[PDB]
């Protein structure tokens, strides 16, 4: 039974990702988040061990649930007549990166470096496990404020990672690459790198660079905040119009702007506590 293993709390929010409640696992008072997804809204389905048919989101979370990482951990799930219920780990205290940037404004580069580094490791983890997130954005990043650790959430737009072209997309348009806008085609890793350029600009300038299709495809990055030349270069490299001109994850993490990152605990003590 699901209502006897967890005490359900207030609604945290709802959207294209379903409805998410705060919760507590009764056995050990572990804080959890309880996500409800309507079966009629699930576009992509998968099968797991023993071929049980589940939402792709459950398949993807199981593949990245391996151990500890910068990804939200799926603890359990249940099928109901018209929905699936997902039990997720819940950091406390927590704030998502969108609200954080709204309240702080443009982040100091030392802080953006630490956050961006942890997002890179998280996305590398997903790709290592065969999972493409397809919706990297500040809204989909939780900050564990006491530990200074970032966690990726909301895999409901993701897919199994492949090397052939993708022709479907349900992530966030203002983070999607110009080859999607123009041709409704993209490849996984290069599209992910584009969204990471959007995210890095978002961090160091206080908001995303583009709102309209014409801006996404136009290929001009105007900096609205003082940003070091090394960071501008990395951003512009990630936002190369031609996908093959974008850096690999290795080239991002080897970029001069990315060196000497703070540890998560240092990040919390210096910038979050």
């Amino acid at each position: 039974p699901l209502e006897s293993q967890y005490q359900v709390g207030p609604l945290l929010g709802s959207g294209g990702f379903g409805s998410v409640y705060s919760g507590i696992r009764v056995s050990d008072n572990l804080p959890v988040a309880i996500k409800h997804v309507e079966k009629d809204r699930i576009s992509d389905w998968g099968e797991l061990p023993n071929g049980t048919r589940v939402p792709m989101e459950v398949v993807l979370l199981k593949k990245v649930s391996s151990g500890f990482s910068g990804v939200i951990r799926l603890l359990d799930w249940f099928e109901r007549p018209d929905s699936f219920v997902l039990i997720l780990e819940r950091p406390e205290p927590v704030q998502d990166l969108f609200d954080f940037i709204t309240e702080r404004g443009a982040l100091q580069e030392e802080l953006a470096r630490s956050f961006f580094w942890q997002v890179l490791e998280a996305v590398r983890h997903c790709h290592n496990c065969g999972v493409l997130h397809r919706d990297i954005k500040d809204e989909n990043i939780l900050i564990d404020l006491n530990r200074g650790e970032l966690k990726l959430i909301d895999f409901g737009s993701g897919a199994l990672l492949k090397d052939t072209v993708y022709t479907d997309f349900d992530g966030t348009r203002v983070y999607s690459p110009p080859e999607w806008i123009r041709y409704h085609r993209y490849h996984g890793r290069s599209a992910a790198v584009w969204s990471l350029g959007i995210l890095l600009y978002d961090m160091v300038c206080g908001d995303i660079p583009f709102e309209h299709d014409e801006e996404i495809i136009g290929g001009q990055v105007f900096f609205r905040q003082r940003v070091s030349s090394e960071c501008q270069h990395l951003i512009r490299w990630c936002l190369a119009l031609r996908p093959s001109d974008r850096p690999t994850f290795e080239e991002i993490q080897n970029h001069p702007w990315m060196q000497d990152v703070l540890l998560p605990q240092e990040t919390a003590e210096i910038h979050l506590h």
Binding site: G15, G16, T102, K137, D154, G156, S157, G171, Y175, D207
Partner: peptide, 9 residues
């Protein structure tokens, strides 16, 4: 300048 969330899914 208006900063806003954007839907997905």
């Amino acid at each position: 300048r208006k900063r806003r969330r954007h839907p997905s899914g």
